C-alpha cells in the first residue's frame, strides 16, 4: 500500500509536467512575443519611404541657392550621396528583417522542444498507470498469500 | 506628389510655373488662387491659377 | 437508374449515409443529418452533381459557406460573435486601431 | 586502353557524373522532365524577380495573419507598379545585323531624382514574328548615379 | 475529377515500378547499354559483347527485376558456364 | 503555418472548384488565370529542360496540376488537423474534409497488369530504342497522384474503423 | 496613346505596359479585385498605326 | 503481463523521442532559417 | 524629442545665411533631409523597443 | 450628395507636418455624419 502511494506521487508529478508543457505548447506565442515580431517587421517597411525621402532631398538640392553677382552653390554630389544613404540603410533593413526571421524560427524550435518534453511526460504518465496495474496485481497476490 | 499602395508618398515632381505666375499680376505677398480637379473620362488634372 | 450507382461508395455518395462504417462509431441523429446535408451541399457546390440552381448558389449563405457555414462550430462562433460581442472583445487588439 | 573518342563526346557521357552514372539521379531527371509539377516549389524559383524575393522573406515568419499578408501584398504591388510604369529612353543593338544579337534598353522610373533600369532582349530567340517570352530579361537597377 | 481533365497526355499509362515503365530500372539498363556497347571497338578485348556475352542476351522481365537472387551464385553460374565452354 | 482558412482563399484566387461569383453573378470560368484558362491541353511536344519551371512555363497545363495538387494538400492537411483531435464531432469534419478531396480526385484509374510488353532481349530493346525509350517503354502514372489516393483511402479506412490517424485502435 | 514600341521593318514589339496605370481603380477595392479575372482583361492600347 | 505492458509503454515513448529527434535532424535547416542566412549574406555584398 | 529637434533644425535652416551682393545660400533640401533622419531613427527605436 | 471628401491638415509645428483625412458622404444621413464614416488622420511622409 505504501508502494502504491509512492507510485501515485510519481504520477501526480508526471501529470503536472505533462499539463504544464501542454500549457506551454497550445499558447506557444503569447501577446508579447508576437508584439516584438510586428514591431521588428514594421522597421523593414521603411526602406521605400526613406528611399523616396532621400531621392526627393537630392533632387531638391541640385537647384541653385545663391544668386546675385555670385551664382551656383548647388551640391553636384547630392545624387551620389542619396544613393549612398539608401544603400547604407538597405544593409540595416536587411539585418532587422533577417533578425525577425531568426527570432521566428527560434520560437518555432522552442515549440518543437515542447513537443519533445510534453510527449516524454505523457509517455512517463502512461507507463506509471500500468506500473500501478502491476502493483495492484502484486498487492492482491499478497492478500491471497495471507 | 501621390500616395502608393503601401501608404508611402512618391517623390514630388516639380513643374515650372514662373511664367504663369508672372502673368498673374499678383498683389505683394498674396497667394495665387490655385484650382485643381480630376476630370471625368479624360485622365487629366486641371491645374489653374 | 438515373443515378448511376454502381458501388457501395457510390451509394454512400448518393444516400449521404456511410454504410461501410463499423458499428463501433456512434453519432447522434441530428449531427448525422447535419453531416449528410453538409456532404450534399459540398457535392453540389463543386458541381460534382450535374447542375445546381445558379440562383440558389448566388445566395449569401453559399458565399459564406467555406468561411462560416460549412462547419457548425464556425457558424455558432459567428452567430454568438454577432449576438454576444463582449465575449470576443479584446482590449489589446482592435480593428481600426489608431 | 582506348575508348572511342566519338562515343565519349556524346551528351550521355557528358551528363554522366551529373545524372546518368547513378540510377536514382537518372530517374529523378526523367521524372522532373516528364512530371514538372512534382518538383515545382512556389517558395523558390529560377529566374525569380528581386521583388518576389522581397515578398518571400517578408512573408516568411512564424505568425501569419490576414493583415500581415495583405500588407506584404501591398508592398509587392508597390514594387511591381513602380517597375511597370517606367519608360524606355534609348537602346543599343549588340550585333552588326539586326537579325541576331541582343538589344539593351534603358528605362527611367517616374521619380524626380530618376532611377535608371537596363533591360536586354534576345533576337535569336525571336521567331515567327513574335518575341519569345523567355527571350526578354527583367529590368535591373543601375546603382551608379545618372 | 483529375482524369476527366488531366488525363490524355499518354494513350496508355502503366503502374509505378513495373518493368514496362520508362522510369523502371530496366529502361535505365537499356538506355545505358545502348551508349555503353560502343565504347570500344569490336576487335578489342575490352569490348562489352566479348567481355560479357551473356549480358547481351539478357531478358528484360519483371522476373529479372523482382527475383533477388544471390550475386555469388550468378558469378558462379557465369564462370562455370564459361569453363564448361572452354 | 496551419492558417487553413486564409490559405483556402489565397489558393482559391488562382483556382476554385466551387466557381467564381462576380457582382453576385456566378462566372462561367473555372480558373482565374488567363494563361491557365486558355491552355487546355499539353503541347504536341514538351520542352526539354532540366528546370521544372521553364518546362511548366512552356506548357502551363502543368501549373494547373501543381495547383490541383496543392488543393489536395490543403484538404488533406485540414482533414489531418481535424483527425488529430479525437472527439466525435471533429472526426466527422475529418471525414467530410477527406470526402471533399476524394471526389475532387475522382475515380482512381484502373491499370491492367497484363500488357503487350513482350519481355524483350536487351540487345533488341536497345536496337529498337537506338533510333534518333518511348519506342518500347511506356509512361507510368504519376506516383505522387497515386499516393494521394493511397493516403486518402487509408485515412478514410481508419475513420470508418474507429482507429486513430496512425492506425492505433 | 502612351504605348512605347520597338519597330523593325514590318515588325513592332511593345516595350512598356499601361496595366499598372489602369490597375489603381482595381486596387481601390482591394486584393479580391486585383486578382480577379476582369483585371487580367485590362486593355493594352494599340501600338503604331 | 502487466510488467510487459509497462515495458511497451516505455518503448512507445522511446520511439516517439527517437523519431521526433530524427525529424529534427533530417530537416536540420528549414525554409526560414536559410532565408535569414541569404538575407544576412546579402547585406555583406553592398560594400563595393 | 529627436523628431522635434530635427524639424526645428530644418525650419531654422531654410532662412538665408549669406547676404550682400550675393544672396540666398539656404538648404532647400533641409526638410527632406530631416524627414529622412527622423525615418532613419524610427527603425532604430522600433528595434530597441 | 455622394462620394468622399479629403481634407488636409497642418500640425502646429514650425517645419509643419501635413495630415490627410477622408470622410464619406454616403454614410452621412439624417443631417448627422456617421461616426464610422470619418477616417483617422494619416501622416504624409513626403516633404511639403
mmCIF file of C-alpha atoms in Angstrom, chain A residues 7-134:
data_model
loop_
_atom_site.group_PDB
_atom_site.id
_atom_site.type_symbol
_atom_site.label_atom_id
_atom_site.label_comp_id
_atom_site.label_asym_id
_atom_site.label_seq_id
_atom_site.Cartn_x
_atom_site.Cartn_y
_atom_site.Cartn_z
ATOM 1 C CA UNK A 7 3.614 5.412 -7.426
ATOM 2 C CA UNK A 8 0.696 7.846 -7.188
ATOM 3 C CA UNK A 9 3.131 10.527 -6.007
ATOM 4 C CA UNK A 10 5.194 9.835 -9.133
ATOM 5 C CA UNK A 11 2.018 10.030 -11.229
ATOM 6 C CA UNK A 12 0.983 13.423 -9.871
ATOM 7 C CA UNK A 13 4.417 14.837 -10.700
ATOM 8 C CA UNK A 14 4.246 13.396 -14.205
ATOM 9 C CA UNK A 15 0.777 14.910 -14.669
ATOM 10 C CA UNK A 16 1.995 18.334 -13.517
ATOM 11 C CA UNK A 17 4.842 18.098 -16.016
ATOM 12 C CA UNK A 18 2.561 16.964 -18.835
ATOM 13 C CA UNK A 19 -0.117 19.610 -18.383
ATOM 14 C CA UNK A 20 2.418 22.404 -17.789
ATOM 15 C CA UNK A 21 4.242 21.528 -21.025
ATOM 16 C CA UNK A 22 0.906 21.343 -22.852
ATOM 17 C CA UNK A 23 0.080 24.780 -21.458
ATOM 18 C CA UNK A 24 3.352 25.947 -22.963
ATOM 19 C CA UNK A 25 2.569 24.330 -26.320
ATOM 20 C CA UNK A 26 -1.009 25.405 -27.042
ATOM 21 C CA UNK A 27 -0.145 29.054 -26.316
ATOM 22 C CA UNK A 28 3.261 28.824 -27.979
ATOM 23 C CA UNK A 29 3.440 32.556 -28.798
ATOM 24 C CA UNK A 30 1.910 34.970 -26.303
ATOM 25 C CA UNK A 31 0.807 38.591 -26.768
ATOM 26 C CA UNK A 32 4.329 39.879 -26.117
ATOM 27 C CA UNK A 33 6.377 37.620 -28.354
ATOM 28 C CA UNK A 34 4.277 38.393 -31.431
ATOM 29 C CA UNK A 35 4.256 42.080 -30.489
ATOM 30 C CA UNK A 36 8.019 42.029 -30.972
ATOM 31 C CA UNK A 37 7.526 40.319 -34.339
ATOM 32 C CA UNK A 38 5.122 43.030 -35.519
ATOM 33 C CA UNK A 39 7.387 45.797 -34.211
ATOM 34 C CA UNK A 40 10.506 44.285 -35.782
ATOM 35 C CA UNK A 41 8.771 43.745 -39.125
ATOM 36 C CA UNK A 42 7.440 47.314 -39.110
ATOM 37 C CA UNK A 43 11.044 48.538 -39.279
ATOM 38 C CA UNK A 44 11.513 46.563 -42.504
ATOM 39 C CA UNK A 45 8.794 48.593 -44.266
ATOM 40 C CA UNK A 46 10.569 51.971 -44.028
ATOM 41 C CA UNK A 47 13.006 51.311 -46.889
ATOM 42 C CA UNK A 48 10.735 52.690 -49.611
ATOM 43 C CA UNK A 49 9.852 55.734 -47.529
ATOM 44 C CA UNK A 50 13.469 56.597 -46.753
ATOM 45 C CA UNK A 51 14.442 55.932 -50.379
ATOM 46 C CA UNK A 52 11.777 58.367 -51.583
ATOM 47 C CA UNK A 53 12.732 60.919 -48.920
ATOM 48 C CA UNK A 54 16.430 60.826 -49.805
ATOM 49 C CA UNK A 55 15.785 60.931 -53.548
ATOM 50 C CA UNK A 56 13.439 63.889 -53.037
ATOM 51 C CA UNK A 57 16.038 65.725 -50.967
ATOM 52 C CA UNK A 58 18.705 65.016 -53.560
ATOM 53 C CA UNK A 59 16.571 66.343 -56.404
ATOM 54 C CA UNK A 60 15.534 69.389 -54.365
ATOM 55 C CA UNK A 61 19.194 70.040 -53.539
ATOM 56 C CA UNK A 62 20.554 70.350 -57.105
ATOM 57 C CA UNK A 63 18.727 73.645 -57.698
ATOM 58 C CA UNK A 64 20.983 76.696 -57.142
ATOM 59 C CA UNK A 65 20.554 78.504 -53.837
ATOM 60 C CA UNK A 66 22.899 81.514 -54.136
ATOM 61 C CA UNK A 67 22.090 84.367 -56.501
ATOM 62 C CA UNK A 68 23.251 87.888 -57.268
ATOM 63 C CA UNK A 69 26.730 88.645 -58.538
ATOM 64 C CA UNK A 70 27.600 85.138 -57.285
ATOM 65 C CA UNK A 71 25.812 82.131 -58.742
ATOM 66 C CA UNK A 72 25.549 78.366 -58.403
ATOM 67 C CA UNK A 73 26.102 76.861 -54.973
ATOM 68 C CA UNK A 74 24.220 73.613 -55.604
ATOM 69 C CA UNK A 75 25.626 70.249 -54.466
ATOM 70 C CA UNK A 76 26.520 68.257 -57.596
ATOM 71 C CA UNK A 77 27.219 65.195 -55.392
ATOM 72 C CA UNK A 78 23.717 65.092 -53.883
ATOM 73 C CA UNK A 79 22.545 62.216 -56.104
ATOM 74 C CA UNK A 80 25.538 60.029 -55.233
ATOM 75 C CA UNK A 81 25.103 60.921 -51.558
ATOM 76 C CA UNK A 82 21.425 59.914 -51.661
ATOM 77 C CA UNK A 83 22.287 56.650 -53.452
ATOM 78 C CA UNK A 84 24.891 56.057 -50.746
ATOM 79 C CA UNK A 85 22.486 56.737 -47.885
ATOM 80 C CA UNK A 86 19.777 54.483 -49.357
ATOM 81 C CA UNK A 87 22.343 51.717 -49.892
ATOM 82 C CA UNK A 88 23.579 52.271 -46.330
ATOM 83 C CA UNK A 89 20.058 51.842 -44.947
ATOM 84 C CA UNK A 90 19.492 48.748 -47.105
ATOM 85 C CA UNK A 91 22.001 46.703 -45.071
ATOM 86 C CA UNK A 92 20.350 47.862 -41.836
ATOM 87 C CA UNK A 93 16.859 46.904 -43.012
ATOM 88 C CA UNK A 94 18.091 43.514 -44.268
ATOM 89 C CA UNK A 95 19.624 42.958 -40.815
ATOM 90 C CA UNK A 96 16.441 43.920 -38.957
ATOM 91 C CA UNK A 97 14.234 41.865 -41.269
ATOM 92 C CA UNK A 98 16.537 38.843 -41.040
ATOM 93 C CA UNK A 99 16.645 39.030 -37.235
ATOM 94 C CA UNK A 100 12.837 38.943 -37.332
ATOM 95 C CA UNK A 101 13.001 35.627 -39.218
ATOM 96 C CA UNK A 102 15.652 34.238 -36.867
ATOM 97 C CA UNK A 103 13.511 35.089 -33.824
ATOM 98 C CA UNK A 104 10.520 33.442 -35.537
ATOM 99 C CA UNK A 105 12.487 30.233 -36.093
ATOM 100 C CA UNK A 106 13.849 30.343 -32.532
ATOM 101 C CA UNK A 107 10.273 30.330 -31.211
ATOM 102 C CA UNK A 108 9.351 27.511 -33.611
ATOM 103 C CA UNK A 109 12.290 25.371 -32.455
ATOM 104 C CA UNK A 110 11.368 26.093 -28.836
ATOM 105 C CA UNK A 111 7.819 24.885 -29.500
ATOM 106 C CA UNK A 112 9.195 21.692 -31.062
ATOM 107 C CA UNK A 113 11.254 21.143 -27.916
ATOM 108 C CA UNK A 114 7.987 21.496 -26.009
ATOM 109 C CA UNK A 115 6.687 18.621 -28.134
ATOM 110 C CA UNK A 116 9.693 16.564 -27.047
ATOM 111 C CA UNK A 117 9.051 17.427 -23.393
ATOM 112 C CA UNK A 118 5.257 17.087 -23.476
ATOM 113 C CA UNK A 119 5.405 13.725 -25.258
ATOM 114 C CA UNK A 120 8.063 12.483 -22.815
ATOM 115 C CA UNK A 121 5.853 13.489 -19.880
ATOM 116 C CA UNK A 122 2.789 11.857 -21.456
ATOM 117 C CA UNK A 123 4.692 8.600 -22.049
ATOM 118 C CA UNK A 124 6.018 8.557 -18.466
ATOM 119 C CA UNK A 125 2.498 9.222 -17.171
ATOM 120 C CA UNK A 126 1.107 6.410 -19.307
ATOM 121 C CA UNK A 127 3.712 3.900 -18.125
ATOM 122 C CA UNK A 128 3.039 4.835 -14.495
ATOM 123 C CA UNK A 129 -0.600 3.730 -14.783
ATOM 124 C CA UNK A 130 0.491 0.285 -15.971
ATOM 125 C CA UNK A 131 3.006 0.188 -13.124
ATOM 126 C CA UNK A 132 0.067 0.754 -10.774
ATOM 127 C CA UNK A 133 -1.831 -2.064 -12.516
ATOM 128 C CA UNK A 134 1.105 -4.416 -11.934
#
